Symmetry: D2
Subunit: 430 residues, 4 copies
């Protein structure tokens, strides 16, 4: 139905600067992560290089924002990259040089934006491109983000509002942006879901003439607005910010269950960025500091396995260049990725005593089974072939291990440690 | 197609239900008369379920207003049974089997309403449960009632004997030949919200009983938060609180359809509720009316049918069918319209603006259906471009309700529509 | 009476407030005119506060509707100041001192409105705070605004310099001679609820400034959950969102009085809000009206006065006083009625039934006051037994508004009252008294 | 203003069977506790002997109710004492013999009731005394207690409703009841505050011709209904059920602060029963079993001190006959009790860093000060005489220790362990 679905036929895969560098990533760091992606990851589907929040804030240095500070901005109330952090933006060029480079590696470029219009634009009453009204005239008088002070909300009822959003995406399209992550737009302690601005953004993107994938954050996204999100966004966060803490991983199983019927081509409920590898370099969120992920290997696999079978977007959050061989291996298994790229129909077969089984399939008849022990005790996790919809014996294969497992006659069953999972492919026997 | 029970409702269930016309109080003769009418005039068009609504076990029921704290007919295993004064064929412990046999012999299916839980009287007396030696009292929830009816207490799934009781109900219903159950006090509750555990117990009881029994959940509003649960466990679930012949409720349905449109699919049908058409309120007092013909105008009646058709709501006629006039019958028996319900898919809201709304769906044959609605208080032209419908070339247009070719359309559809008026159009490729 | 500031409002504050008549936009001349009228006609009856309501620091204000994100008049220490166009005497950095002096010289007191917090323009520029080296930006709350006015941000009590800022405000206001402050966006908020920490900072600032400044909190509805806080920190606090000349709001006030009646006492007055009497809406567009004489009927005006009087609400007249007619003035100058407000205590709802309500209070001389109200839509007799009032013997009765003896009452008070009509009666002993 | 205030001029003091015997106390146990009270406690103000919930449930055996069971009841839908548990009730005499016994010890008798009318009376449609209506005709069809199944609410709009409540208090007056604790009346997860039944009960009591003190439970009582409670009840629970757990004692400090201005002659916000001594004998609530209170001595003193100065009612919840000398000493200190009986004006002077100070005074100009360390660390807690409103030097006395402390010029200050407090009387010097 919606033409923008075609811009994310499979769930976006990429890297994002938040979990490693907070609000404070530099051009060099972005370039380095992109080169690593081009060399090691691109053949496996990884393509978006996403510069997260506050690229326009020259003093940023953490995940903790510096409030009420001046921001880099043009003459039409549009935020611009901080030239100290992004030297190629010198001379009003913005992100075009960086995006060109990223494109020339065969990759795509993404940026984060905050909903609304900068508070400094409203206070100075700076202009809006393509109209005579000023920033001050389109601002909402009672709309802010509770966790960031950079913007005021824009009031769609005002003349000039749509013109401002159109102008942002004209700029982003000039730069060659392929992906935008909009924040303060879905969940808000204060206001709930900013529906009208979602619609203005959809329209601005559609008018800008370039394919720009739309990601919405933070969650929890309400199910009440499922139609709105399905029709307007290519991805939307199911959850508040995800981090390397078991509790949050445990909690994702329920959210996936809740959203599984809205997952489809072009429209991807989002389990959030993968806190893997080296994170917290200039971030202080998630209760950690400079570290390798606190997920155990079993946990890392369990996460990847859930996000894969569910078909969450996959946005690696660590500094890629500090990957070890284990971490890289999680990203380069073609057999596992097939489940994410070509699987469909994922569903929870059952959840009982903190054992969970999910299943999906491909069009070639392969069935994929993810089996999870999310309890604190080692146990056998099993599922009958009948509950999977398989009426005869099947062959099984362990996709992470790339190992044939042999014939299965009545049930799949595996000993799994606490927090441990397995991902299996079933195919006809003999 | 994960769930086997989806095959029991491959298209949205179509039938009649006794609530809007007879409240809690329908009799056997009334049910049979409505079934005979269905068999004769409606069955070849898809209409097949004959559904006895709430309180068939309350011999004194006489209205849509319940008589609270009264005794109920019940067998020796805490299971509610039909009131024999209202359903004489149930004499001698036969329950609904004779009435269901009669209905089946007309080529129709038989449905009943149940209230969630176990009868209060069974819990106080501590009567037995079939297949276990715990009593009714031991499976009841100590803090779960229905705020608008006093017959039951909720059943606590953590108690031994709970599943056994629900299994035993569906054993009984399968013995009778029930093909459809509408469960009430299960989805929305002022007091408790959604009774998820009992939904699951019911799903299991039905799956164990050995007979196809379609599952309908009521009342709404169903929360989207539980979309997965409903989609996987029920064949239909009410999007709204009880729907009646009042414009305000019909107006409100537009939004609910928008909110639930992505969960509509084979076997799992969000439910816009029964159709308050024809003669209603005979022994019902709800909806702010009494004995009457529907207060919906013909325009409103067509707008309702048009939304429910394109969206693919189940269709449960609520009036006393034998009193249908030609107009009312015509709303049920337009083959071209019903093709949209039976063979359309992908219904979506194209836009809603200034109380004008357009919906569209399609079939596999290259037709596109467009429902255009003026839901404002003023007469106005409602339009939609072919481009917004996804049609790249000119199309032939036809008015489905009027069965009238409208000719070639090159750029847009546009019609003058009165307030609360609509039109349903098929677009097909030009010659 | 354990808090010293109770002594600053031993009886409920009485005065005039520029909001209902001029919105945010009152001028120096208008303030002076109202003060002069108060001095001449009202002062001997207890009316003394002359209160300049919101946005005296906004030079372009012209309505009850605020002009958002506009520059505000401010000094070099992030403190808002009077707009010199609207208040010419404030020229040369003098602020309100001249205007306050003039009011004081009439034998009156001076009040102003403030918005909770620190001006957004101070925070964005990071202007200084008097008495510290931290800037305005460093004391702001990052997630605290007012949902209906854009002038400020909230101040975060946990930050060094927060208290110093509020201290500096009340040093300024004390210099000017302010005797009363109404703080807004402090009690009820759609977004944040009650700003308790700032209430406490404001209490402390006032206590440190060395001058008696009566503290009024607004808007309501004030939650009972914070009763102790309000009782111990404020002299008055609004029970209700903004009150206007609409019967529905007057009807509603009966319940709020009932809910707050036990917290009424010397120095701490639940507030039923300003009296929309006389000429209002001159440069205000709120309450669903424009330039008008109050839409309250005479009966309704009396009913309002009678409830606020017996309950002991503060009395803040909201009309332009100089356009008072005789009738309106008469509502304010009845000493017998005012005695109930000044010297009554123990007010309570005797009953409320079928939209008939009776309240009673008493004085220390054993007089008993009874206010009887028909708040229904039909004319009816409203009555109450002497027994229900706790009177054990027959009493003499007097109609306090009419100043008319009603004679002896043996068993009950009863009066035929039109819809929205009320009566206020004094009962005094007959036994042991001459004839 | 309200005549019933004269029935509780000081906060009621007594014993209640709940914390020790749950719903299941017997006649002998009540009599034993009463005899103890008469012998050891009565001269110090302790007088009420209160039979708590479900005296009408013959099978009761715990604090956990047996749900949906038949209940002992007369022909007029009125619950009656279970004769197995209360043998003197044999022959329809109800609690009159027991109350007479208690009265003959110079004590007062109290019972607990649940709001409403018994479900069994509604289902059988038993009569209401004095009318031609039945129980079924006065019941609310959507009003239950979420934590007990014995009753349905009564609908005040129905003919007979008042007549039912009048009949209950006629019965209770016949027995000689002096105090009724009504439960399921103030806070309800499901319905909030049952204001209409509070008013019917007030009226029923006023019509019965006997002084019956009215206690409402459980809390938390909403301040929003302060007036209603102040004018209709003699006591009302500030909190959900209180037990011997520090966390709940800590929490009470705030509730006292919130309610302190509504405390006054005849109308006492209620901090709930004192879990002292031997409790949990046939109760399983509070996360304990058969035990001596888990409160440390300091905590016990801290509890007593706050309840005393605030002027909460004092209802001892242990089995009195198993008291040791320590526990008894908490109940028989006249100097401390004077603060409860004759103090007034209690207020929180401050609360800072988990140190709290309260003060009140008497009419002779004595000033009482309760100083609490409610933190986890030993520390000095202090308060200036100026903050107390004391203008000159004062003599100080430790009321619990009965020890003169000497002259105090500027401040009171004491080293206090965590959870420890002290109670001091200040009086004029020389």
């Amino acid at each position: 139905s919606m033409h923008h679905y075609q811009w994310a036929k499979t769930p976006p895969m990429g890297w994002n600067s938040w979990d490693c560098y907070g609000a404070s990533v530099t051009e060099d760091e972005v370039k380095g992560n992109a080169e690593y992606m081009a060399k090691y990851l691109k053949p496996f589907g990884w393509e978006y290089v996403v510069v997260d929040i506050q690229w326009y804030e020259p003093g940023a240095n953490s995940s903790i924002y510096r409030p009420f500070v001046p921001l880099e901005m043009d003459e039409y109330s549009r935020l611009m990259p901080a030239v100290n952090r992004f030297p190629s933006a010198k001379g009003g060029k913005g992100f075009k040089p960086l995006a060109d480079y990223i494109h020339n590696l065969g990759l795509k470029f993404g940026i984060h934006i905050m909903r609304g219009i900068p508070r400094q634009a409203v206070h100075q009453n700076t202009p809006i491109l393509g109209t005579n009204v000023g920033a001050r005239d389109i601002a909402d008088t009672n709309s802010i983000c509770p966790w960031n002070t950079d913007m005021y909300g824009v009031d769609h009822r005002k003349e000039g509002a749509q013109a401002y959003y159109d102008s942002l995406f004209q700029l982003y399209a000039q730069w060659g942006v392929d992906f935008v992550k909009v924040a303060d737009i879905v969940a808000s302690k204060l206001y709930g879901t900013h529906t009208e601005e979602i619609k203005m953004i959809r329209k601005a993107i559609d008018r800008c003439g370039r394919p720009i994938v739309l990601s919405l954050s933070p969650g929890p996204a309400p199910l009440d607005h499922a139609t709105l999100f399905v029709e307007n966004a290519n991805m939307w966060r199911m959850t508040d910010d995800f981090w390397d803490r078991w509790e949050l991983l445990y909690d994702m199983f329920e959210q996936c269950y809740k959203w599984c019927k809205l997952v489809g081509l072009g429209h991807w409920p989002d389990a959030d960025m993968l806190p893997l590898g080296h994170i917290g370099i200039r971030s202080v969120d998630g209760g950690g500091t400079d570290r390798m992920t606190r997920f155990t290997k079993d946990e890392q696999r369990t996460m990847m396995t859930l996000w894969i079978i569910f078909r969450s977007p996959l946005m690696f959050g660590g500094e890629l260049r500090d990957n070890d061989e284990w971490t890289l291996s999680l990203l380069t298994n073609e057999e596992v990725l097939h489940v994410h790229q070509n699987g469909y129909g994922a569903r929870q077969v059952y959840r009982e005593n903190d054992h969970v089984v999910w299943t999906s399939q491909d069009a070639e008849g392969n069935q994929f089974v993810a089996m999870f022990n999310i309890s604190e005790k080692r146990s056998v996790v099993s599922v009958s072939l009948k509950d999977l919809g398989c009426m005869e014996p099947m062959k099984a294969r362990d996709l992470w291990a790339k190992e044939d497992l042999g014939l299965v006659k009545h049930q799949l069953a595996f000993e799994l440690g606490p927090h441990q999972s397995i991902l299996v492919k079933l195919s006809p026997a003999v």
